[PDB]
């Protein structure tokens, strides 16, 4: 099954990805990182709403899929697959290991086979987002409150100043749009550098 | 105790730019030697000026025009606690700017439990009675203030004349 995740919280080795050398690895629990109206716009869904982690530790793949399903099913219930856009901004690349044990040969040839994927967070790493309209900003905060109980440690839910997932404030966005320096890609904002 | 200081410093002349901009910082420290080090902390942190290339021109000690009378003091500060930074406007009633700043380091260490390492003041200034908006300090600017001294002290009037016996019992009533 699994260990309790208090086993694999803090980081006591170098990072250990899926590669030539690791070999016998099971694939992660996550497939979809991103749900809702993916094909939308910066201008259509300006209001954004992040979940920031306040610890330096490992986050499991099992936590991140629990957080997606609890996020979707609240936002499906309230407003009904139109406005919202959910995204997950951790990708689990670190592979865990086990000594197994299950007569026995314990602590001899201690290196162990990979058990599961994990994501290494950093103090103030955003581990989730919800982009939405001003009508359902209320619903976005109540979603990320529920998603925070999935994750280890403690974790602040924050309304961002900046538009979309773009790195531009609402004050800056009108000045660049007006200037005509910025442009619109199918999704997100692509700047014009005049070169 | 803390003394208000004004420190002005500058970077050395390069051949590219002789006579650069100097910069001043208001600092609060027990003596002239500590006041330099508080200046180099704030100058490095903000205006990008290091100890290893800069003069320091004038440590001016700010004495009060009058310490005879009482003034109100607004103190805008940030203080840092684990996981967050908070901005607070707090105010005080005192003879001088230093004694207000010495008060709030005790009050933050008391009430919020943060040391002077974490605290970073924005603005101290004296403030009039009209613009003053906090209720517990506004009461002392009114006329006809009575409060009793409930709970008197038992101390020695001089440290020679203390004693650990008494025939009669002391009365600690306000009266």
């Amino acid at each position: 099954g699994r260990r309790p995740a208090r086993c694999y919280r803090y980081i006591g080795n170098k990072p250990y990805p899926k590669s030539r050398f690791c070999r016998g690895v099971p694939d992660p629990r996550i497939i979809r990182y991103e749900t809702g109206t993916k094909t939308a716009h910066a201008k259509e869904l300006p209001i954004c709403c992040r979940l920031i982690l306040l610890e330096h530790e490992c986050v499991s793949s099992e936590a991140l899929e629990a957080a997606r399903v609890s996020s979707n099913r609240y936002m499906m219930k309230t407003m009904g697959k139109d406005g919202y856009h959910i995204k997950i901004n951790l990708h689990p690349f670190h592979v865990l290991r086990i000594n197994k044990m299950l007569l026995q040969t314990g602590m001899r040839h201690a290196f162990g086979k990979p058990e599961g994927l994990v994501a290494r967070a950093n103090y103030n790493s955003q581990i989730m987002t919800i982009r939405t309209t001003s009508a359902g900003l209320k619903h976005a905060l109540e979603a990320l409150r529920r998603a925070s109980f999935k994750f280890p440690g403690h974790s602040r839910v924050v309304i961002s100043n900046k538009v979309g997932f773009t790195p531009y404030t609402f004050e800056q966005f009108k000045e660049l749009q007006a200037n005509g320096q910025i442009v619109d890609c199918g999704n997100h904002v692509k700047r014009v550098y005049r070169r | 105790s803390l003394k208000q200081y004004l420190v002005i410093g500058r970077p050395y002349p390069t051949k590219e730019i002789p006579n650069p901009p100097a910069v001043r910082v208001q600092v609060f420290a027990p003596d002239e030697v500590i006041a330099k080090s508080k200046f180099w902390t704030v100058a490095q942190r903000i205006a990008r000026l290091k100890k290893a290339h800069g003069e320091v021109l004038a440590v001016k000690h700010v004495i009060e025009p009058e310490p005879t009378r009482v003034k109100n003091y607004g103190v805008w500060l940030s203080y840092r606690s684990t996981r967050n930074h908070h901005n607070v406007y707090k105010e005080y009633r005192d003879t001088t700017t230093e004694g207000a700043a010495t008060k709030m380091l005790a009050e933050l260490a008391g009430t919020h439990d943060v040391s002077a390492d974490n605290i970073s003041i924005i603005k101290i200034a004296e403030v009039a009675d009209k613009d003053l908006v906090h209720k517990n300090i506004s009461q002392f600017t009114h006329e006809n203030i009575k409060f009793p001294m409930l709970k008197q002290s038992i101390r020695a009037p001089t440290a020679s004349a203390r004693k650990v016996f008494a025939a009669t019992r002391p009365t600690v009533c306000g009266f």
Binding site: - | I8, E55, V56, L57, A58
Partner: protein, 60 residues
């Protein structure tokens, strides 16, 4: 007077820096790094509460 001249003008008289110092050894011998007691042996400050005058330049 060189200080009081500059204040009346506008400027600042910055003073001359200290040409030498006086260096009390405060802490004793033991639990100490070998580079950092090679350096004390060069000032001849071997015992606790010892002192000499030391000239100030970017070497010292």
């Amino acid at each position: 007077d060189a200080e009081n001249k500059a204040t009346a003008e506008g400027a600042f008289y910055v003073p001359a820096e200290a040409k030498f110092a006086f260096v009390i050894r405060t802490k004793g011998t033991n639990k100490l790094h070998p580079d950092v007691r090679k350096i004390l042996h060069l000032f001849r400050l071997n015992q606790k509460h010892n002192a000499i005058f030391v000239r100030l330049n970017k070497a010292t």
